Ligand binder design. Structure first.
Ligand SMILES: COc1ccc(NC(=O)CN)cc1
Ligand SMILES: COc1ccc(NC(=O)CN)cc1
Lengths: 264, 265
């Protein structure tokens, strides 16, 4: 991996691993999501971050994912090389955005794209704080000044309002728990595990006959390592689904999302 | 990755990823186990396998893991480079063995080692069988002829008989289920998931104060994607030792037994 010539974005190549592929001999969407997360971390390290700034560590402030949107046109097989380009952008006082472009390293064609919204939070009180002027200045020297969007189109899937699934759900997977492998270096559940949990309630026949083209996921609350999750799905339609992750006990919402699947 | 000069072993380098590390800022034993599996698959591909031979595919035969033994002296941090060397060896009609040596690519020092026993099974009936002469000749051209052991020592930990945990277990983690990420390309539960399930019943205080040095795991039966597992652990012991058992949640059918050795940080 390396920052590009202008130093305002970062590229990295990954050779797809044997254990990273699913039943259709291609990388799972969870493998793709882990690769996006890895190239984002490597971009942060290359420009001097932990992605907390100096002001943020003094104030006990962190960036948290509010939304993840991923569109995949082609999944890579075991042995294939995926090139990922990533960059960040300030969105005023609302927060920050991280975007990705996925390419087949051999042909140079675009095989996918992703966008994510991040909000500022106090790590102890868990209260959202709105971006301050001091923090914005520290982040802007690493971001392109003119807008650079992975999803530019006016009225695109990435900025759609997602509704709350109504009981009863058409499909469900109950009693989902994280294990130690699902936790990051700070003992928090990895954001990619929530994507896996959402997809657990899609029936196996859809997975066997369709490929996932689009996934939009809102993050409302964290799931703790001792929490239990229920995954709910309803067909809204290509096949489209509405999703809800909630705590098994009280029914507290942790995530809501939508998926779009194409017939193979 | 590449086969070595003599073509009888395979080497590969891996840079440790941000999502591959645990609470200690080092690679989890599950990340290590996935890397061993990846370098084993790349070794098989480099010499023409897919690791069924031509005779095995004709007779609906597969290699299945009977035992996995891993010893780690040092865990790599995010950004570190781990070099893994792997090779195979015939063990007569009992089966085959795959061995690994893990090194720090920068210093060249040995940071870990692993050995695994594989038995032949008919894919459909699930019946184990001894290795035939025709199969033996087909993989001996890819194996060193003189013995080459990652665990050469006489009374080494890798060949120890593991007992069956007696109820009640000291610790337990109940209702463990695989998700789609835990399944391989053939929709079978990945062998590394069983290692994670065994470790789920170790208390968090041991994980917070000790590092895993050794893990020996016997594979008795396969867990299906719609099966539920219970993970059981009892302390048997500076060092901490545990006895482990994975069994199906319903009938209590054994799927795995194992032992772990942990050293104080
Ligand atoms: C109430 O505000 C929020 C709280 C939590 C999140 N996200 C996560 O904690 C998921 N990693 C997003 C917004
Ligand atoms: C009946 O004998 C055996 C059955 C299964 C295994 N191993 C695995 O299925 C590992 N996933 C080993 C021996």
């Amino acid at each position: 991996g390396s920052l590009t010539e202008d130093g305002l974005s970062y590229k990295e190549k990954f050779v797809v691993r044997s254990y990273e592929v699913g039943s259709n001999k291609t990388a799972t969407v969870e493998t793709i999501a882990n690769l996006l997360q890895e190239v984002g971390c490597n971009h942060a390290q290359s420009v001097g971050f932990s992605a907390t700034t100096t002001t943020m560590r003094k104030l006990h402030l962190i960036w948290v994912t509010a939304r993840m949107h991923i569109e995949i046109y082609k999944y890579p097989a075991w042995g294939d090389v995926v090139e990922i380009e990533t960059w960040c952008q300030s969105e005023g006082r609302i927060g920050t955005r991280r975007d990705w472009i996925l390419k087949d390293s051999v042909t140079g064609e675009v095989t996918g794209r992703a966008t994510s919204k991040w909000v500022m939070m106090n790590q102890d009180t868990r209260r959202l704080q709105k971006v301050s002027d001091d923090v914005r200045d520290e982040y802007l020297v690493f971001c392109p000044q003119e807008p650079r969007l992975a999803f530019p189109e006016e009225n695109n899937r990435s900025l759609k309002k997602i509704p709350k699934l109504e009981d009863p759900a058409q499909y469900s997977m109950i009693g989902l728990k994280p294990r130690r492998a699902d936790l990051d270096m700070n003992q928090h559940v990895n954001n990619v595990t929530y994507i896996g949990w959402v997809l657990e309630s899609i029936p196996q026949e859809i997975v066997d006959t369709h490929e996932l083209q689009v996934i939009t996921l809102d993050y409302r609350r964290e799931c703790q390592q001792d929490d239990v999750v229920d995954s709910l799905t309803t067909t809204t339609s290509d096949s489209q689904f509405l999703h809800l992750l909630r705590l098994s006990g009280d029914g507290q919402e942790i995530n809501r999302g939508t998926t779009l699947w194409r017939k193979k």
